[PDB]
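Morning - manganese (II) ion inputs below, output right after.
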Amino acid sequence: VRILGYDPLASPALLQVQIPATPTSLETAKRGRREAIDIITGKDDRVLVIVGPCSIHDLEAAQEYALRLKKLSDELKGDLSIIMRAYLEKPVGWKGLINDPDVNNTFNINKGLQSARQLFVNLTNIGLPIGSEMLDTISPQYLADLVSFGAIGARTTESQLHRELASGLSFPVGFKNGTDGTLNVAVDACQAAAHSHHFMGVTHGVAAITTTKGNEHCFVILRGGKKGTNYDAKSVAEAKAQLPAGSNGLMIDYSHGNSNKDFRNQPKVNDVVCEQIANGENAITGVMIESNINEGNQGIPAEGKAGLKYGVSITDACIGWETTEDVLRKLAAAVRQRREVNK
Amino acid sequence: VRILGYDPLASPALLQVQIPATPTSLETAKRGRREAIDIITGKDDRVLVIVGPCSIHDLEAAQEYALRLKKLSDELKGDLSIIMRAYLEPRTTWKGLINDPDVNNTFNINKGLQSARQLFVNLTNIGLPIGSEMLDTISPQYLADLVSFGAIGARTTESQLHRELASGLSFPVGFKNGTDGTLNVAVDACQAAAHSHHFMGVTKHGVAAITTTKGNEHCFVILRGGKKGTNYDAKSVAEAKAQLPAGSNGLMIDYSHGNSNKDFRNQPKVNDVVCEQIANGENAITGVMIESNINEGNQGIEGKAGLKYGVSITDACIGWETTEDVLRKLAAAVRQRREVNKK
Ligand SMILES: [Mn+2]
Ligand SMILES: [Mn+2]
């Protein structure tokens, strides 16, 4: 009585055929996973960097950005393992690329899944690994094969459904610290996801029973909270203090809460973080940066896509490309100096 | 690479044909919903009660308990509208009736769903309405037609997935406050559940499709305490009422879990404090949740064979006679409130 109806949904298998992943895309995704694993587990001393737009609403602009990040990745491969941020939505307002690909308030999930997949293929096909946030348990079925890094939404860190999901993904997954500032829920999540799980889920577009093997590559993401920002050494210490033995490295988000809701502070956070890294801090193995071709953000005008400024986020504000180069080169320097403190 | 494999899953439709609901079952489910609605909206001045085991692992024992509650219910029907707790499982490393129906640390979801549906039919068949937690977006499809009340656990009240599910359910849904004791996430969930959603889900035939729901105006908050302490006292209740927007439904207080502090004998103490408020005129308290079984306490696991009869194998519960005394007191508080209101 509360279900208006069901509209047809193309299965992942069908989508994978219409928008096939090139050998390069597959190899790229595989490579991104290996590198991320070695870093969060300490086998590698470079830093894992998830850099990119808060969200992608324009494939062309994303491709130009990707090409720039690719070039700069090759320049800093020795110190950084860069994965492009390819998030589809920011949890009223534009519901994201999957739900509203045309950015016109309509709903076209089938067209959305096609755009999202075309995007993922486009990016990985040039040798650039991507990372996306797992919003639900069904969409990953359509994109996972092209992902090298996944993050679980903060609102679902405590969800068994997402912990089960994580336990079955073929790549590292990050969980955010609780809203109260503590790391319990995230730690529990990582432990839960490490176990094998048995559950019902979509596969061919039908529901089946899944058995996962468990994911040992889950880590905590520091993202500020009710007790303030937590990227500083004091907070980092408190964070490591509550990480049971055998934990993976921590990943720090420069944006959102830790940036005090101001894209301009991301580089300031970079400074405080680079400082720790340069002085020998080995628990910080990753960072998250919201960057785009141009800085800041913009609202969606009455006209729609037609009135949007090119290369400017329509969700959270980002630092521009030039600033991103500065931030990343500085981070790379911090990593280099860190190898020395470890000599 | 982290998916050990899949096993075929009988569809909700198949199981509904296999284990059909009797005309008495459907009628009870319907009635349970109508009565719950009139209460949470303030039409009826009786109190809604969701009483029953933490979980059901023994169908026979559940039936005995049901007969008793059905009889006690007929006695108090003038003051209370009773719905029996018929839950299957919070994940804390027994996996529940759906996963481990044999209570022997194995997995058989197909058999679990059958036992669950049979259980639901058995109970509603004697005229006793039932309530359960809505775990995911799939399992409910196998039981919805028999349910009169649904609950969203504290660990998933923030899950968009569950808010979407609630908006499409044919009965009232209660959202529990967060594990940290935070109430706004539940108030929030009710708002979200109140309107239409468009997302990916599964049909009666087990096919993934795009679902459009209409919104559920019968959602409410369930105070169940948490990390920052219990929340059933007058101060907390007034604090809770303050957060609720205009036109909100009444509150439901959970005597167990966070509000009893892992001590079943605290449930009757909560009942006294809650009764005092009701007896003295508190009209905003429209519901209560109680963890009750034939015999009090709980127990661990020779397998089922060794387990004591009417005793839970999950959260401790108050025994039957305690339950009866608790309910009769609650009933009196109700009658008293009527008198206070006529003034
Ligand atoms: Mn963002
Ligand atoms: Mn319980």
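Note: Residues 1-343 of chain A form a domain with the TIM Barrel fold (CATH 3.20.20.70).

O.
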